[PDB]
């Protein structure tokens, strides 16, 4: 199973 | 109390001080009733043994300490063995069992036949052999079980041969996992992973099904696809039992310097129902494309995209998405690029639309449209601004006229102001230039011909006034204040025969209180109605002790000294009134308390002899879970006939106008439950036009939801009676109001 989530800029 | 406080009560709390840094070098404190052996080679501790070493704690009836000098190793191997009532407690997990073993050098701990429970979060279980490796990073369990419910509740559980719980990866890999509901297992997999954290991870999302009446049983099995930190992708195979095929719903959210978008491309390879309805079509595939983007780059460049493109008009009336409703007359297709600085902004945009109607498929489109403003204040006591627009109208049909319109609107207004008033003169010129081609058809049929080239230059003079009074409301509460803001505008645009210009983009705008003082009868720019009016409105507000507007009412009227003629007056008013107080318009907003709050509106019109439109609402909202809203929207048949197309005044579905009482409610029950309602009624026809009854049962480890909705879903021409459409659906999510209230076709819209 997976998990969504708000995006962010890569480090 | 909220559910968060309820669940944390059953979750153990780490009251001990937290020791940061490496605990390997910290001193070892042992407290036992008896100590026998040969320290430091062999030490045996018996009787209420307590071990301290930083955050970690270890208590057992008997503890044996064994140190061996491993050859070639500067530090001797220190091993700790615990016998009888072993209770390992730290800042991350609590371990219980009869027997335990510990390796102090590598922090490795083994427990036989015990149960666990991590601290600070939900979750528990029991394993035959419990092992910690890699400085508490890996919590390996053999023949273990894992569930997120609080102790004493057995809703669901997972049992697997090898459970690996990587704290760093926030994943709980389970081998030979047998997912169990209570004591009954239902799903068996050789290998299973659970994202036990907040890190984004690929893998299937939790399915949700729903039963409708357009497709019968349906089922969503999304597969999230974590592409990268700033791009993901969901690929939901959507099944429709009636249509006998799977529709593939692909999403793709991204995030860049240019903004944060969202694509979408649903797609049904073949449709049995659509094959039956239209047997003469070559292929029966149904697809949607929804691209939506919105960003600002360098605080100057603005990019917006809003693009929807269904395959056939009856898409949204068939499949329900989040990107369109059955209540949609057309799908919008807009791109725009802007460049906005402090005193300038050119925005080139394109607008194309896809009408879902077979009565008239003639659509117009701007391709491209350029909007240029340029303000320049402090030109002495004046201000200034220049508005320029170039636009190219192309019709979908090949016969209707096309045009290229260029516009220039050099405003200049002189603002005056004191403590109690403000008069704001404003002159303006409107130099619109047309170039119309492909006129043979329209000119051949109609009498009023269209010129190939049209110039239209019209001055516009406006004089806005205003004054403000104040008073102390001693007959209300002590300290309350009242105002009174009698505004009074005068406007004047001369008359220019605008009958040789086809109406590419001009519709009658509404006239609430705010839109009385507007200086445009028609939106857009093809029809600039001549005017010679004076507007008079008066707005009263009632401030309390902290100067917080508790109430405001407004009534304004327009007084046309001369009829507003565009030279192409095809509107159909109930009478022949032309000058005088033709339009009135009210507006209130009473904030009865911190929770209550009322609104209002009305736009009586004397040319209709009937209250044109008038809404309302009285929402009581203590919280997002406890709210009761009423409302009302009216729009008389005279307004429908005198504003919307000709056949809106003859079809039985459109000719009655609006009169729509509808109540939205939401209320918890036993704090663990919830109910959400909505019921919009159409008092003209005494027929329902929506409803809903969402019910949710939230708990610590799972929350279930069961919606419902019977909505108006089209019209049956043969029987001349509308067609409804149920849609009961079930969602599960392991641990919701605002996603229930905003689902039906008339979504909840807060009035506070």
């Amino acid at each position: 199973c997976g998990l969504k989530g708000p995006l962010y800029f890569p480090p | 109390a909220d559910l968060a406080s309820q669940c944390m009560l059953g979750v153990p709390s780490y009251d001990r001080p937290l020791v940061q840094g490496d605990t390997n070098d910290l001193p070892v404190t042992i407290n036992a009733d008896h100590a026998k052996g040969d320290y430091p080679d062999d030490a045996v501790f018996t009787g209420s043994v307590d071990i301290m070493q930083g955050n970690s704690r270890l208590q057992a009836d008997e503890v044996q300490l064994h140190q061996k000098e491993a050859p070639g190793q500067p530090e001797p191997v220190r091993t700790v063995d615990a016998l009888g009532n072993v209770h390992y407690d730290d800042n991350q997990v609590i371990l219980k069992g009869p027997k335990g073993w510990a390796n102090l050098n590598t922090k490795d701990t083994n427990v036989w036949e015990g149960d666990y429970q991590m601290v600070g979060r939900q979750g528990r279980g029991k394993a035959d052999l419990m092992k910690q490796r890699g400085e508490n990073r890996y919590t390996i369990l053999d023949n273990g079980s894992f569930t997120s419910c609080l102790p004493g509740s057995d809703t669901w559980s997972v049992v697997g041969s090898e459970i690996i719980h990587d704290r760093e990866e926030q994943v709980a890999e389970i081998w030979n996992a047998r997912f169990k509901v209570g004591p009954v297992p239902i799903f068996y997999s050789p290998y299973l992973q659970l994202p036990v954290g907040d890190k984004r991870r690929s893998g299937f999302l939790i399915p949700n099904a729903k039963y409708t009446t357009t497709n019968y049983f349906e089922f969503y099995l999304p597969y999230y696809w974590n592409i990268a930190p700033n791009m993901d992708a969901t690929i939901t195979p959507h099944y429709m039992h009636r249509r006998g095929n799977i529709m593939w719903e692909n999403e793709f959210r991204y995030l860049s310097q240019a903004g944060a978008g969202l694509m979408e491309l649903d797609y049904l390879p073949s449709d049995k129902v659509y094959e039956d309805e239209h047997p003469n079509d070559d292929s029966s595939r149904r697809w949607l494309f929804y691209w939506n983007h919105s960003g600002v780059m360098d605080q100057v460049w603005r990019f917006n995209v809003d693009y929807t493109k269904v395959s056939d008009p009856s898409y949204f009336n068939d499949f329900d998405n989040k990107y369109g409703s059955s209540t949609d007359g057309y799908a919008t297709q807009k791109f725009s690029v802007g460049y906005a600085v402090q005193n300038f902004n050119a925005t080139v945009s394109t607008k194309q639309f896809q009408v879902f109607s077979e009565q008239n498929t003639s659509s117009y489109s701007a391709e491209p449209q350029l909007d240029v403003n340029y303000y320049q204040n402090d030109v002495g006591p004046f201000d200034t601004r220049i508005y320029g627009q170039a636009v190219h109208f192309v019709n979908t049909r090949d016969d209707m006229p096309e045009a290229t319109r260029v516009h220039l609107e050099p405003t200049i207004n002189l603002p005056l102001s004191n403590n109690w008033g403000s008069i704001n003169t404003e002159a303006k010129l409107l130099a619109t230039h047309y170039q119309q081609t492909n006129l043979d058809w329209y000119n051949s049929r109609n009498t009023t011909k269209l010129d190939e080239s049209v110039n239209r230059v019209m001055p516009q003079f406006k004089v806005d006034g205003k004054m403000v009074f104040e008073r102390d409301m001693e007959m209300l509460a002590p300290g309350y204040t009242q105002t009174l803001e009698p505004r009074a505008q005068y406007l004047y645009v001369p008359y220019r025969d605008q009958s040789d210009i086809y109406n590419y983009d001009s519709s009658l705008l509404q006239s609430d209180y705010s839109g009385l003082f507007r200086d445009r009868t028609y939106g857009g720019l093809d029809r600039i109605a001549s005017a010679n009016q004076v507007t008079t409105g008066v707005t009263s507000r009632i401030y309390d002790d902290a100067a917080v507007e508790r109430f405001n009412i407004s009534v304004g009227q327009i007084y046309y000294f001369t009829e507003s003629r565009t030279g192409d007056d095809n509107i159909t008013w109930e009478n022949d009134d032309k000058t005088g107080s033709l339009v009135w318009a009210g507006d209130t907003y009473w904030r009865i308390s911190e929770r209550w709050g009322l609104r209002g509106g009305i736009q009586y019109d004397t040319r209709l002899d009937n209250v044109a439109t008038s809404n309302s609402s009285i929402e009581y909202r203590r919280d997002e879970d406890r709210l009761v809203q009423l409302n009302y929207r009216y729009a008389s048949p005279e307004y429908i006939q005198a504003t919307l197309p000709k056949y809106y005044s003859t079809a039985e579905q459109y000719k009655n106008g609006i009169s729509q009482v509808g109540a939205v409610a939401s209320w918890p029950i036993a704090d663990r439950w919830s109910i959400v309602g909505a019921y919009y009624y159409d008092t003209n026809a005494n027929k329902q036009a929506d409803s809903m009854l969402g019910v949710q049962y939230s708990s610590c480890c799972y929350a279930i939801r069961v919606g419902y909705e019977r909505k108006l879903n089209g019209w049956d021409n043969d029987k001349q009676h509308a067609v409804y459409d149920n849609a009961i659906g079930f969602n599960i999510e392991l641990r919701g109001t605002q996603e229930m209230l905003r689902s039906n076709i008339l979504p909840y819209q807060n009035t506070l």
């Binding site: - | 600002v296 605080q299 100057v300 209540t327 949609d328 007359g329 807009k334 906005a340 600085v341 402090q342 902004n345 607008k351 639309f353 009408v355 109607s357 003639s362 117009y364 489109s365 701007a366 109208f393 102001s417 403590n419 004054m467 403000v468 009074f469 104040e470 008073r471 105002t483 109406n503 590419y504 983009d505 519709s507 705008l509 705010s514 445009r520 939106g523 857009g524 401030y543 902290a546 100067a547 917080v548 507007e549 729009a635 919307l644 459109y654 009655n656 609006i658 919009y680 026809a685 036009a689 929506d690 108006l712 879903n713 089209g714 509308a722 008339l746 979504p747 819209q749 009035t751 506070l752």
Partner: protein, 154 residues
């Protein structure tokens, strides 16, 4: 009936100079608010000024939401209701931070035959909603001054 012409300005006396910070300083809401503060005789400083005692008005997210509000007898939208929801804060320096918001409701009848004209009408409505929300924020500054005074009395 007791009516007397208003004595004090719309903005308080202590905010007559104020920094207009924002996240999208060239947008349409910041333009509406800047114009409104100009019409009230407020001195606007850059965010980079060296004056510290001056209060500041920070503008937050603007969220235009357009939804169906009333359907004809056949499902079709007959009336779209639009909301603007401006959030903002005022950080009087040496005191707390007072949040002020707005909310403008507008509606308009949908018309598929003239869809382009209704999109031009929607854009005009949104510009006017920005103007209304800018008005509503500047009518909340006196409450902020009152709360600041009350905290001073405490």
């Amino acid at each position: 009936c007791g009516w007397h012409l208003r004595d004090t300005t719309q903005v308080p006396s202590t905010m007559k100079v104020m920094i207009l910070d924002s996240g999208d300083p060239n947008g349409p809401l910041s333009r509406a608010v800047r114009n409104q503060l100009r019409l009230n005789g407020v001195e606007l400083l850059d965010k980079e000024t060296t004056r510290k005692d001056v209060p500041s008005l920070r503008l937050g997210k603007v969220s235009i939401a357009k939804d169906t509000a009333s359907v004809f007898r056949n499902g079709q939208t007959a009336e779209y209701q639009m909301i603007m929801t401006v959030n903002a804060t005022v950080l009087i320096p040496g005191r707390d931070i007072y949040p002020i918001s707005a909310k403008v409701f507008r509606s308009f009848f949908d018309n598929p035959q003239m869809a382009l004209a209704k999109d031009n009408e929607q854009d005009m409505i949104v510009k006017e909603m920005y103007d209304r929300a800018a008005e509503q924020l500047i009518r909340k500054l006196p409450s902020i001054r009152a709360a600041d005074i009350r905290s001073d009395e405490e």
